[PDB]
Design an enzyme around this catalytic site. Structure first.
Site, PDB file in Angstrom:
ATOM      1  N   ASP A 123       0.866  -1.203   0.000  1.00  0.00           N
ATOM      2  CA  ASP A 123       0.000   0.000   0.000  1.00  0.00           C
ATOM      3  C   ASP A 123       0.904   1.256   0.000  1.00  0.00           C
ATOM      4  O   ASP A 123       1.943   1.273  -0.688  1.00  0.00           O
ATOM      5  CB  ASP A 123      -0.966  -0.069   1.215  1.00  0.00           C
ATOM      6  CG  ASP A 123      -2.075   1.008   1.199  1.00  0.00           C
ATOM      7  OD1 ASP A 123      -3.169   0.763   0.628  1.00  0.00           O
ATOM      8  OD2 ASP A 123      -1.857   2.092   1.779  1.00  0.00           O
ATOM      9  N   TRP A 174     -13.341   1.924  -0.536  1.00  0.00           N
ATOM     10  CA  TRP A 174     -12.276   2.141   0.434  1.00  0.00           C
ATOM     11  C   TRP A 174     -12.199   3.622   0.795  1.00  0.00           C
ATOM     12  O   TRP A 174     -12.290   4.001   1.968  1.00  0.00           O
ATOM     13  CB  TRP A 174     -10.977   1.644  -0.203  1.00  0.00           C
ATOM     14  CG  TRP A 174      -9.665   2.035   0.391  1.00  0.00           C
ATOM     15  CD1 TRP A 174      -8.997   3.222   0.213  1.00  0.00           C
ATOM     16  CD2 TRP A 174      -8.791   1.200   1.172  1.00  0.00           C
ATOM     17  NE1 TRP A 174      -7.770   3.188   0.862  1.00  0.00           N
ATOM     18  CE2 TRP A 174      -7.622   1.957   1.453  1.00  0.00           C
ATOM     19  CE3 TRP A 174      -8.891  -0.105   1.679  1.00  0.00           C
ATOM     20  CZ2 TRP A 174      -6.573   1.451   2.230  1.00  0.00           C
ATOM     21  CZ3 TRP A 174      -7.826  -0.616   2.432  1.00  0.00           C
ATOM     22  CH2 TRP A 174      -6.688   0.165   2.699  1.00  0.00           C
ATOM     23  N   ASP A 259      -7.519  -9.039  -3.663  1.00  0.00           N
ATOM     24  CA  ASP A 259      -7.517  -7.594  -3.480  1.00  0.00           C
ATOM     25  C   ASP A 259      -8.271  -6.890  -4.607  1.00  0.00           C
ATOM     26  O   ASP A 259      -7.981  -7.097  -5.790  1.00  0.00           O
ATOM     27  CB  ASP A 259      -6.085  -7.079  -3.378  1.00  0.00           C
ATOM     28  CG  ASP A 259      -6.016  -5.601  -3.030  1.00  0.00           C
ATOM     29  OD1 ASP A 259      -7.064  -4.965  -2.692  1.00  0.00           O
ATOM     30  OD2 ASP A 259      -4.889  -5.077  -3.100  1.00  0.00           O
ATOM     31  N   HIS A 288      -6.240  -7.164   0.385  1.00  0.00           N
ATOM     32  CA  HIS A 288      -5.329  -6.021   0.295  1.00  0.00           C
ATOM     33  C   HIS A 288      -4.184  -6.128   1.299  1.00  0.00           C
ATOM     34  O   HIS A 288      -3.044  -5.783   0.991  1.00  0.00           O
ATOM     35  CB  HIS A 288      -6.099  -4.717   0.495  1.00  0.00           C
ATOM     36  CG  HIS A 288      -5.298  -3.482   0.203  1.00  0.00           C
ATOM     37  ND1 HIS A 288      -4.743  -3.229  -1.035  1.00  0.00           N
ATOM     38  CD2 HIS A 288      -4.966  -2.427   0.986  1.00  0.00           C
ATOM     39  CE1 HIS A 288      -4.100  -2.073  -1.001  1.00  0.00           C
ATOM     40  NE2 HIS A 288      -4.230  -1.560   0.213  1.00  0.00           N
TER      41      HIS A 288
END
EC number: 3.8.1.5
Length: 308
Positions: A123, A174, A259, A288
């Site tokens: 990320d 998200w 993901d 994720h």
């Protein structure tokens, strides 16, 4: 820099975070701010695993990986970004920028004089972390990459922009989840996006944030994915050239196949940009947060590096 500090008692009841606090003061460009980092394993070790977290997490995300890396005989450093974990937290969203976070990492590496680095990223840990080696290439030796990419412009790498708008239950959801609620409960958010978490573990992600005033950093991250400033575009574009043309270190890639954000659609294009990147470890059931299969990933990475 107007900032607040999470009271220590918020961290009293943490599950599976037996790791002791270390702090850095007076980093250049960060007056008045104290940063927290973990420093585990043999302090005099030759190899250092630098584990960088993303949104909306902290070094807690690496709790399952750190002991594996430590037991291999390496030092492990896991910093919390300003705005997260046990680090100080600027209160104004406008203070959080790509450069703000990047220059912090550079300053921390220099201050601790980290060398023989295995960079471990996911990320935002990756969006930022992947731009570090080109600034001081001699310090970096290996890369462990989990669901991450570079925040370049949509024309340069359409794969690193398309995820922003599709699927609806992906980055769109998200970002909606993070930026809209007045009362943002990250324990509930993390149980949603990392459904293997127990309530004890999920609670650790709420721990840094007594209330909304502590969450400016959390709110800003997804806005920076959606709207990329010029520094971000430029630096991320420069990084592409580094990974393609200059990197000659060892790489291990692990993909959370389920993901909805940075899955195969993003990670295969990313693999192609990294010189010498092997075929990815595909974790069929991971989402994720690949780190919730973190023990497996760390163990497999170590084996791969030892084997080649």
């Amino acid at each position: 820099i107007n900032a607040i500090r999470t009271p220590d008692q918020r961290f009293s009841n943490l599950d599976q975070y037996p790791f002791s606090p270390n702090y850095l003061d007076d980093l250049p460009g960060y007056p008045g701010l104290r940063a927290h980092y973990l420093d585990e394993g043999n302090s005099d070790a030759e190899d250092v695993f630098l584990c960088l977290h993303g949104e909306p997490t902290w070094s807690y995300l690496y709790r399952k990986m750190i002991p594996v890396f430590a037991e291999s005989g390496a030092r492990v450093i896991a910093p919390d970004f300003f705005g997260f974990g046990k680090s100080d937290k600027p209160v104004d969203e406008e203070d959080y920028t790509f450069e703000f976070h990047r220059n912090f990492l550079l300053a921390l590496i220099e201050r601790l004089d980290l060398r023989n680095i295995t960079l471990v990223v996911q990320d935002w840990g990756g969006f930022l972390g992947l731009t570090l080696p080109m600034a001081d290439p001699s310090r970096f030796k290996r890369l462990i990459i989990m669901n991450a990419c570079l925040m370049t412009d949509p024309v340069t790498q359409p794969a690193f922009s398309a995820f922003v708008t599709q699927p609806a239950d992906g980055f769109t959801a998200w970002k909606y989840d993070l930026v809209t609620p007045s009362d943002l409960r990250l324990d509930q958010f993390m149980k949603r996006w990392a459904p293997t978490l127990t309530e004890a573990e999920a609670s650790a992600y709420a721990a840094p944030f007594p209330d909304t005033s502590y969450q400016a950093g959390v709110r800003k991250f997804p806005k920076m994915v959606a709207q990329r400033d010029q520094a971000c575009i430029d630096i991320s574009t420069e990084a592409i050239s580094f990974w393609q043309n200059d990197w000659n270190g060892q790489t291990f890639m692990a993909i959370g196949m389920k993901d909805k954000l940075l899955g195969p659609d993003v990670m295969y294009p990313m693999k192609a940009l990294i010189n010498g990147c092997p075929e990815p470890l595909e974790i069929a059931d991971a989402g994720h947060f690949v780190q919730e299969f973190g023990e497996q990933v760390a163990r497999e990475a170590l084996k791969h590096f030892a084997e080649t």
